[PDB]
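User: quick one - fold this with manganese (II) ion bound?
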Amino acid sequence: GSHMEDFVRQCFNPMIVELAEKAMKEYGEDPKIETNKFAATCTHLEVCFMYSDGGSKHRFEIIEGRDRIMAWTVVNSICNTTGVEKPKFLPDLYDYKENRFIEIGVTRREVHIYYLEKANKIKSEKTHIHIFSFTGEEMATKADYTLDEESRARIKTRLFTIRQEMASRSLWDSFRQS
Ligand SMILES: C[C@H](C[C@@H](C[C@H](C[C@@H](C[C@@H](CCN1CCCC1=O)N1CCCC1=O)N1CCCC1=O)N1CCCC1=O)N1CCCC1=O)N1CCCC1=O
Ligand SMILES: [Mn+2]
Ligand SMILES: [Mn+2]
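Assistant: Sure. Structure tokens for the protein plus manganese (II) ion:
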């Protein structure tokens, strides 16, 4: 293994690592080689999970972290029972409160740039978007941030802590270049 893989293993909890490996292998990437993508997958998974935790008990359905076939199955059930249009790309969550899918992004650039990229990619219009960065900023569709301030603040703090740990291991720089 590499230093990035050992860091990933000591940084994220093991269930997150396992789901990241699964998701990456399902697309033919090897966690032990494409280690930057491994860290990014772990970070994105943890953010999705903290986010779904931020709501009320029954509020969100978690799409991310399932195998692709089961993810689309759950998306189909949500669409067929709520009547919301089927997105073109797998979202990360479904909000039963606001009645909408959510795409979550975690970026090492400007939340503006990544938001524009994702919103050009989606084009299905009704899928809410919520971007976080590793510097503490966030941006969301209709400036509607879904959760209260405190849950988003916890996510932002975690992102900055991951950033610092990577820097202490001199892995932040190459990570920030992908
Ligand atoms: C005990 C607790 C663990 C965390 C786990 C949770 C993430 C998420 C995990 C799985 C489990 C469902 N599976 C397993 C395989 C098949 C399948 O469908 N997936 C993936 C797809 C959807 C889903 O549900 N969920 C959500 C509900 C319960 C659960 O497990 N969350 C949420 C916060 C951050 C985090 O990691 N939980 C559980 C709820 C409270 C909590 O924090 N611990 C131990 C100490 C640290 C810690 O967080
Ligand atoms: Mn996703
Ligand atoms: Mn996402």
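One thing worth noting: The chain has one domain: 1-178.
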